Design a binder for this molecule. Structure first.
Ligand SMILES: N#Cc1cccc(-c2c[nH]c3ncnc(N4CCOCC4)c23)c1
Ligand SMILES: [Mn+2]
Length: 290
């Protein structure tokens, strides 16, 4: 039973005008689309189910997790449609670019980094309160609306905790951002997302996560072996400390998302999300001169 799945008589090729490919998600490509009834722009992920086996279970879970989320900090889910062998997953469209794209014209300043991290933390606090774990936190999965609103996307590997299953052990995520306990498949919880947040903070400050120049297989031994990464360069002490707070090998030593919302780096530097339009405009202009 796939949540939000619509009637098979509903033809998504009739209900939506599929436009250009905007990227990829887990299991399929993502396209920009227009909802023909409201004229609102949507993001559509298309999965060829015939081109899949033992992935439908992971596909169902992504949809279930998305459907149970109701937050200004998480991409909205508008239902699923089956067209022959292809599943159309309709999601909220965010036109501002990902935090990673916004890094292309040049570095971010600490106000921008703090603002983005604060909104990610709002999303993480929501998910964690709902006993959900995102598991793929990185700048490419942090999307902005054209107004500067920041939301979490890519629920392809998200997990659910229950009163019976208080911890997860599955190997999921993107190597460079994965927590040591996830890579070693130890019992883990929401603290794994706090480690990925620390890596994301380095990425927002430097433009790339640690070990970015290495093969992802090398990081599978390096992350559990090495001391946790630190933020190197001329960055503020509160920013380096924020990074260090997230990047502790001991998960119980990592603060919760709610606690990090009161970190001095956030409180001293974060500003209204509306200021992020300057970053969106900077990217639009840059793109136009490439
Ligand atoms: N499954 C999933 C998935 C993963 C990551 C992001 C999104 C996504 C939702 N709304 C969007 N609006 C604008 N760009 C978006 N992305 C598409 C992926 O490439 C980058 C640009 C999205 C969906
Ligand atoms: Mn992805």
């Amino acid at each position: 039973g796939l949540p939000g799945m619509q009637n098979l008589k509903a033809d998504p090729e009739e209900l939506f005008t599929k436009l250009e490919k905007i990227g990829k998600g887990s299991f399929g490509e993502v396209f920009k689309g227009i909802d023909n009834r409201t004229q609102k722009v949507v993001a559509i992920k298309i999965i060829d189910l015939e081109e899949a086996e033992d992935e439908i279970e992971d596909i169902q879970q992504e949809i279930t997790v998305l459907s149970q989320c109701d937050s200004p900090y998480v991409t909205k889910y508008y239902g699923s449609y089956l067209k022959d062998t292809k599943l159309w997953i309709i999601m909220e469209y965010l036109g501002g670019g990902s935090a990673l794209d916004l890094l292309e014209p040049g570095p971010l300043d600490e106000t921008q980094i703090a603002t983005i991290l604060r909104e990610i933390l709002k999303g993480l606090d929501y998910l964690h309160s709902e006993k959900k774990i995102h598991r793929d936190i990185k700048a490419a999965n942090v999307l902005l609306s054209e107004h500067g609103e920041v939301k979490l996307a890519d629920f392809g590997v998200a997990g659910q905790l229950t009163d019976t299953q208080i911890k997860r052990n599955t190997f999921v995520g993107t190597p460079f951002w994965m927590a040591p306990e996830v890579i070693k498949q130890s019992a883990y919880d929401s603290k794994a997302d706090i480690w990925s947040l620390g890596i994301t903070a380095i990425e927002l400050a430097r433009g790339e996560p640690p070990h970015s120049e290495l093969h992802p297989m090398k990081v599978l031994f390096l992350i559990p072996k090495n001391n946790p990464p630190t933020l190197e360069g001329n960055y503020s002490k509160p920013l380096k400390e924020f990074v260090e707070a997230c990047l502790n090998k001991e998960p119980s030593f990592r603060p919760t998302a709610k606690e990090l919302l009161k970190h001095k780096f956030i409180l001293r530097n974060a500003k209204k999300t509306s200021y992020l339009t300057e970053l969106i405009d900077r990217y639009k202009r840059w793109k136009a001169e490439q």
